[PDB]
Protein backbone atom coordinates (compact mmCIF):
# COMPACT_ATOMS: atom_id res chain seq x y z
CA UNK A 1 0.00 0.00 0.00
CA UNK A 2 2.24 2.83 1.31
CA UNK A 3 5.64 1.64 0.11
CA UNK A 4 8.02 -1.34 -0.45
CA UNK A 5 8.41 -1.92 3.29
CA UNK A 6 4.62 -2.16 3.78
CA UNK A 7 3.15 -5.50 4.84
CA UNK A 8 -0.16 -6.54 3.29
CA UNK A 9 -2.03 -9.33 5.17
CA UNK A 10 -2.77 -12.74 3.64
CA UNK A 11 -5.73 -12.56 1.26
CA UNK A 12 -8.03 -14.62 3.48
CA UNK A 13 -7.08 -12.44 6.45
CA UNK A 14 -7.60 -9.28 4.41
CA UNK A 15 -11.10 -10.57 3.63
CA UNK A 16 -11.53 -11.51 7.30
CA UNK A 17 -12.79 -15.02 6.52
CA UNK A 18 -9.98 -17.26 7.84
CA UNK A 19 -8.48 -17.30 11.34
CA UNK A 20 -5.03 -18.68 10.57
CA UNK A 21 -3.96 -19.03 14.19
CA UNK A 22 -6.90 -21.34 14.86
CA UNK A 23 -6.45 -23.02 11.48
CA UNK A 24 -2.98 -24.24 12.44
CA UNK A 25 -4.09 -25.72 15.77
CA UNK A 26 -6.91 -27.30 13.80
CA UNK A 27 -4.63 -28.85 11.18
CA UNK A 28 -2.31 -30.31 13.82
CA UNK A 29 -4.78 -33.11 14.59
CA UNK A 30 -4.22 -34.71 11.20
CA UNK A 31 -7.96 -35.44 11.00
CA UNK A 32 -10.31 -33.83 8.43
CA UNK A 33 -12.17 -30.67 9.39
CA UNK A 34 -15.95 -30.61 9.78
CA UNK A 35 -16.31 -27.04 8.49
CA UNK A 36 -19.47 -25.57 10.04
CA UNK A 37 -20.58 -22.31 8.39
CA UNK A 38 -23.79 -20.26 8.60
CA UNK A 39 -25.85 -17.82 6.56
CA UNK A 40 -28.86 -15.61 7.24
CA UNK A 41 -31.07 -18.11 5.42
CA UNK A 42 -28.97 -21.29 5.25
CA UNK A 43 -26.52 -23.66 6.99
CA UNK A 44 -23.61 -25.55 5.40
CA UNK A 45 -21.41 -28.45 6.59
CA UNK A 46 -18.33 -29.61 4.70
CA UNK A 47 -15.86 -32.42 5.39
CA UNK A 48 -12.53 -30.92 4.35
CA UNK A 49 -9.14 -32.55 3.93
CA UNK A 50 -5.73 -31.01 3.17
CA UNK A 51 -4.40 -30.79 -0.39
CA UNK A 52 -1.29 -29.76 -2.47
CA UNK A 53 -3.07 -26.78 -4.07
CA UNK A 54 -5.72 -26.06 -1.47
CA UNK A 55 -8.29 -27.85 0.66
CA UNK A 56 -10.36 -30.80 -0.53
CA UNK A 57 -14.04 -31.36 0.18
CA UNK A 58 -14.74 -35.08 0.40
CA UNK A 59 -18.38 -34.68 1.47
CA UNK A 60 -20.77 -31.82 2.17
CA UNK A 61 -24.39 -30.77 2.73
CA UNK A 62 -26.30 -27.48 2.44
CA UNK A 63 -29.57 -26.78 4.27
CA UNK A 64 -31.16 -25.98 0.89
CA UNK A 65 -30.82 -29.55 -0.36
CA UNK A 66 -32.42 -30.65 2.90
CA UNK A 67 -35.87 -30.07 1.32
CA UNK A 68 -34.97 -32.66 -1.33
CA UNK A 69 -35.85 -35.24 1.36
CA UNK A 70 -39.18 -33.82 2.50
CA UNK A 71 -38.45 -30.58 4.33
CA UNK A 72 -41.13 -27.93 4.01
CA UNK A 73 -39.81 -25.83 6.92
CA UNK A 74 -37.35 -22.87 6.88
CA UNK A 75 -33.58 -23.42 6.68
CA UNK A 76 -31.86 -21.23 9.27
CA UNK A 77 -32.92 -22.79 12.56
CA UNK A 78 -31.80 -25.49 15.00
CA UNK A 79 -33.56 -28.52 13.42
CA UNK A 80 -32.24 -27.34 10.06
CA UNK A 81 -28.67 -27.08 11.39
CA UNK A 82 -28.63 -30.49 13.13
CA UNK A 83 -30.16 -32.18 10.07
CA UNK A 84 -27.68 -30.57 7.68
CA UNK A 85 -24.93 -31.96 9.90
CA UNK A 86 -26.38 -35.47 9.95
CA UNK A 87 -26.81 -35.38 6.18
CA UNK A 88 -23.20 -34.27 5.68
CA UNK A 89 -22.05 -36.81 8.25
CA UNK A 90 -23.82 -39.58 6.35
CA UNK A 91 -22.35 -38.65 2.97
CA UNK A 92 -18.99 -38.51 4.76
CA UNK A 93 -19.33 -42.04 6.12
CA UNK A 94 -20.09 -43.12 2.56
CA UNK A 95 -16.86 -41.57 1.20
CA UNK A 96 -14.73 -43.50 3.70
CA UNK A 97 -14.39 -40.63 6.19
CA UNK A 98 -14.46 -41.87 9.80
CA UNK A 99 -13.26 -39.04 12.06
CA UNK A 100 -13.06 -35.26 12.06
CA UNK A 101 -12.41 -32.13 14.13
CA UNK A 102 -14.95 -29.30 14.39
CA UNK A 103 -13.93 -26.11 12.62
CA UNK A 104 -16.43 -23.35 13.43
CA UNK A 105 -14.44 -20.61 11.72
CA UNK A 106 -15.23 -17.09 12.91
CA UNK A 107 -18.38 -18.22 14.76
CA UNK A 108 -18.67 -18.11 18.56
CA UNK A 109 -18.53 -21.33 20.70
CA UNK A 110 -21.75 -20.32 22.43
CA UNK A 111 -23.44 -23.16 24.38
CA UNK A 112 -26.32 -24.69 22.46
CA UNK A 113 -25.53 -22.80 19.23
CA UNK A 114 -26.17 -24.09 15.71
CA UNK A 115 -22.56 -25.05 14.91
CA UNK A 116 -22.64 -27.40 17.91
CA UNK A 117 -25.93 -28.72 16.56
CA UNK A 118 -24.20 -29.26 13.21
CA UNK A 119 -21.57 -31.14 15.16
CA UNK A 120 -24.12 -33.26 17.03
CA UNK A 121 -25.66 -34.33 13.72
CA UNK A 122 -22.37 -35.39 12.13
CA UNK A 123 -21.50 -37.42 15.24
CA UNK A 124 -24.92 -39.11 15.14
CA UNK A 125 -24.23 -39.95 11.51
CA UNK A 126 -21.41 -42.14 12.83
CA UNK A 127 -18.41 -39.79 12.70
CA UNK A 128 -15.85 -39.71 15.54
CA UNK A 129 -15.47 -36.04 16.42
CA UNK A 130 -13.95 -34.70 19.68
CA UNK A 131 -16.85 -32.96 21.43
CA UNK A 132 -18.37 -31.96 24.77
CA UNK A 133 -21.99 -32.87 25.56
CA UNK A 134 -22.75 -30.05 28.01
CA UNK A 135 -21.91 -27.49 25.36
CA UNK A 136 -24.53 -28.96 23.00
CA UNK A 137 -28.15 -27.78 23.08
CA UNK A 138 -31.03 -29.58 24.81
CA UNK A 139 -32.47 -32.35 22.61
CA UNK A 140 -35.78 -30.49 22.52
CA UNK A 141 -34.34 -27.18 21.33
CA UNK A 142 -32.57 -29.18 18.59
CA UNK A 143 -35.98 -30.49 17.53
CA UNK A 144 -37.21 -26.93 17.37
CA UNK A 145 -39.37 -26.94 20.48
CA UNK A 146 -38.23 -23.42 21.42
CA UNK A 147 -39.83 -22.18 18.21
CA UNK A 148 -43.05 -24.20 18.59
CA UNK A 149 -43.58 -22.67 22.06
CA UNK A 150 -42.84 -19.24 20.56
CA UNK A 151 -45.66 -19.69 18.05
CA UNK A 152 -47.79 -20.72 21.03
CA UNK A 153 -47.50 -17.04 22.00
CA UNK A 154 -49.48 -16.51 18.79
CA UNK A 155 -52.05 -13.74 18.15
CA UNK A 156 -50.08 -13.43 14.89
CA UNK A 157 -48.58 -16.33 12.88
CA UNK A 158 -44.83 -16.84 13.29
CA UNK A 159 -44.42 -18.21 9.78
CA UNK A 160 -45.47 -16.19 6.72
CA UNK A 161 -45.90 -18.71 3.90
CA UNK A 162 -48.04 -21.46 5.38
CA UNK A 163 -46.08 -24.50 6.44
CA UNK A 164 -48.45 -24.81 9.42
CA UNK A 165 -50.01 -22.65 12.15
CA UNK A 166 -48.54 -24.08 15.37
CA UNK A 167 -45.49 -25.54 13.59
CA UNK A 168 -44.25 -29.12 13.66
CA UNK A 169 -41.00 -30.13 15.43
CA UNK A 170 -42.41 -33.59 14.68
CA UNK A 171 -41.32 -32.85 11.11
CA UNK A 172 -37.79 -32.87 12.46
CA UNK A 173 -38.50 -36.34 13.87
CA UNK A 174 -39.92 -37.45 10.51
CA UNK A 175 -36.90 -36.17 8.60
CA UNK A 176 -34.30 -37.57 11.01
CA UNK A 177 -36.24 -40.84 10.77
CA UNK A 178 -35.87 -40.68 6.98
CA UNK A 179 -32.09 -40.11 7.00
CA UNK A 180 -31.18 -42.83 9.50
CA UNK A 181 -32.96 -45.26 7.18
CA UNK A 182 -30.50 -47.48 5.29
CA UNK A 183 -31.96 -46.80 1.81
CA UNK A 184 -32.19 -43.08 0.88
CA UNK A 185 -30.46 -41.68 -2.21
CA UNK A 186 -27.63 -39.53 -0.78
Amino acid sequence: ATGPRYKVPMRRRREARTDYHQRLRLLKSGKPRLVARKSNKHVRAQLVTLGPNGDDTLASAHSSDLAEYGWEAPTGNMPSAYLTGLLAGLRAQEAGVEEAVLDIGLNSPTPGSKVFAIQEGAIDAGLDIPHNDDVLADWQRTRGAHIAEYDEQLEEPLYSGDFDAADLPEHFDELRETLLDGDIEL
Binding site: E15, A16, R17, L106, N107
Partner: protein, 140 residues
Protein backbone atom coordinates in the same frame (compact mmCIF):
# COMPACT_ATOMS: atom_id res chain seq x y z
CA UNK B 1 -32.53 3.92 -3.16
CA UNK B 2 -33.51 6.74 -0.79
CA UNK B 3 -34.58 4.27 1.91
CA UNK B 4 -31.32 2.33 2.24
CA UNK B 5 -29.57 5.71 2.41
CA UNK B 6 -31.59 7.75 4.91
CA UNK B 7 -29.62 8.23 8.20
CA UNK B 8 -30.48 6.91 11.64
CA UNK B 9 -29.17 7.09 15.19
CA UNK B 10 -26.53 4.45 15.91
CA UNK B 11 -26.02 5.41 19.55
CA UNK B 12 -26.23 8.26 22.07
CA UNK B 13 -23.48 8.24 24.68
CA UNK B 14 -24.00 10.42 27.76
CA UNK B 15 -20.85 10.71 29.86
CA UNK B 16 -19.47 12.62 32.85
CA UNK B 17 -15.68 12.84 33.08
CA UNK B 18 -15.10 13.63 36.76
CA UNK B 19 -11.57 12.66 37.79
CA UNK B 20 -12.09 10.80 41.07
CA UNK B 21 -18.52 8.28 41.18
CA UNK B 22 -21.49 9.73 43.05
CA UNK B 23 -22.58 10.90 39.59
CA UNK B 24 -23.76 7.44 38.46
CA UNK B 25 -27.13 7.97 40.18
CA UNK B 26 -28.20 10.93 38.01
CA UNK B 27 -27.28 9.31 34.67
CA UNK B 28 -29.31 6.23 35.54
CA UNK B 29 -32.45 8.27 36.19
CA UNK B 30 -31.97 10.63 33.21
CA UNK B 31 -31.34 7.94 30.55
CA UNK B 32 -33.28 4.92 31.77
CA UNK B 33 -30.60 2.22 31.76
CA UNK B 34 -27.70 1.24 34.04
CA UNK B 35 -24.35 3.06 33.50
CA UNK B 36 -20.72 1.89 33.47
CA UNK B 37 -17.57 3.23 35.14
CA UNK B 38 -14.69 4.85 33.27
CA UNK B 39 -10.99 4.20 33.99
CA UNK B 40 -7.74 5.74 32.75
CA UNK B 41 -4.19 5.13 31.53
CA UNK B 42 -0.81 6.85 32.10
CA UNK B 43 0.21 8.50 35.40
CA UNK B 44 -0.98 12.08 35.89
CA UNK B 45 0.32 14.85 38.15
CA UNK B 46 -3.26 15.96 38.90
CA UNK B 47 -3.40 13.14 41.48
CA UNK B 48 -3.92 10.18 39.15
CA UNK B 49 -1.11 7.77 40.11
CA UNK B 50 -3.48 4.80 40.14
CA UNK B 51 -3.74 3.66 36.50
CA UNK B 52 -6.88 1.52 36.48
CA UNK B 53 -9.40 3.38 38.64
CA UNK B 54 -12.81 5.13 38.41
CA UNK B 55 -12.79 8.65 36.94
CA UNK B 56 -16.15 8.90 35.21
CA UNK B 57 -19.08 7.03 33.69
CA UNK B 58 -21.13 6.73 30.51
CA UNK B 59 -24.27 5.23 28.98
CA UNK B 60 -24.68 4.09 25.39
CA UNK B 61 -28.30 4.54 24.32
CA UNK B 62 -29.77 2.74 21.31
CA UNK B 63 -33.21 2.68 19.64
CA UNK B 64 -36.14 3.96 21.73
CA UNK B 65 -33.93 4.59 24.77
CA UNK B 66 -31.98 6.99 22.55
CA UNK B 67 -34.81 8.88 20.84
CA UNK B 68 -36.89 9.19 24.02
CA UNK B 69 -33.79 10.73 25.59
CA UNK B 70 -33.01 12.97 22.61
CA UNK B 71 -36.52 14.47 22.53
CA UNK B 72 -35.72 16.05 25.91
CA UNK B 73 -31.96 16.37 25.40
CA UNK B 74 -31.75 18.30 22.13
CA UNK B 75 -33.90 21.22 23.42
CA UNK B 76 -31.36 21.78 26.21
CA UNK B 77 -28.58 22.41 23.68
CA UNK B 78 -27.77 25.29 21.34
CA UNK B 79 -26.50 23.42 18.27
CA UNK B 80 -23.86 24.90 15.97
CA UNK B 81 -22.22 24.26 12.59
CA UNK B 82 -18.69 23.72 13.96
CA UNK B 83 -20.08 21.24 16.51
CA UNK B 84 -20.25 18.63 13.75
CA UNK B 85 -17.86 15.75 13.08
CA UNK B 86 -16.70 15.04 9.53
CA UNK B 87 -18.47 11.67 9.89
CA UNK B 88 -21.78 13.40 10.55
CA UNK B 89 -21.61 13.11 14.34
CA UNK B 90 -21.85 15.80 17.02
CA UNK B 91 -21.23 16.38 20.73
CA UNK B 92 -22.49 19.07 23.13
CA UNK B 93 -22.34 20.16 26.78
CA UNK B 94 -22.06 16.14 31.26
CA UNK B 95 -21.51 15.49 27.55
CA UNK B 96 -24.01 14.00 25.11
CA UNK B 97 -22.87 12.48 21.81
CA UNK B 98 -24.99 11.27 18.90
CA UNK B 99 -23.56 8.73 16.47
CA UNK B 100 -25.26 8.95 13.06
CA UNK B 101 -24.99 6.55 10.11
CA UNK B 102 -26.60 4.95 7.00
CA UNK B 103 -28.50 1.54 7.16
CA UNK B 104 -25.88 -1.11 6.31
CA UNK B 105 -23.41 -0.08 9.02
CA UNK B 106 -23.32 -3.62 10.43
CA UNK B 107 -20.85 -4.48 7.66
CA UNK B 108 -18.09 -2.71 9.62
CA UNK B 109 -19.29 -3.76 13.09
CA UNK B 110 -19.73 -7.53 12.59
CA UNK B 111 -17.05 -10.21 13.00
CA UNK B 112 -17.25 -12.30 9.80
CA UNK B 113 -16.05 -10.68 6.58
CA UNK B 114 -16.23 -7.22 8.12
CA UNK B 115 -15.37 -4.33 5.80
CA UNK B 116 -14.87 -0.61 6.27
CA UNK B 117 -17.71 1.59 4.95
CA UNK B 118 -16.90 3.38 1.61
CA UNK B 119 -16.56 7.18 1.67
CA UNK B 120 -19.52 7.52 -0.75
CA UNK B 121 -21.75 5.72 1.76
CA UNK B 122 -20.43 7.48 4.86
CA UNK B 123 -22.67 10.20 6.26
CA UNK B 124 -21.71 13.85 5.71
CA UNK B 125 -21.88 16.87 8.07
CA UNK B 126 -24.40 18.46 5.70
CA UNK B 127 -26.50 15.30 5.32
CA UNK B 128 -26.40 15.01 9.10
CA UNK B 129 -27.48 18.60 9.85
CA UNK B 130 -30.42 18.14 7.46
CA UNK B 131 -31.64 14.85 8.96
CA UNK B 132 -31.34 16.21 12.50
CA UNK B 133 -32.78 19.64 11.67
CA UNK B 134 -35.69 17.85 9.99
CA UNK B 135 -36.68 16.69 13.49
CA UNK B 136 -37.81 19.38 15.98
CA UNK B 137 -35.06 22.10 15.98
CA UNK B 138 -32.77 24.60 14.18
CA UNK B 139 -29.15 24.59 12.86
CA UNK B 140 -26.06 26.91 12.89
Amino acid sequence: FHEMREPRIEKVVVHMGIGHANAEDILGEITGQMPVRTKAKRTVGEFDIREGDPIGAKVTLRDEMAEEFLQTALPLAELATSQFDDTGNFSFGLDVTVNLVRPGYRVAKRDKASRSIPTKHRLNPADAVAFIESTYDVEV
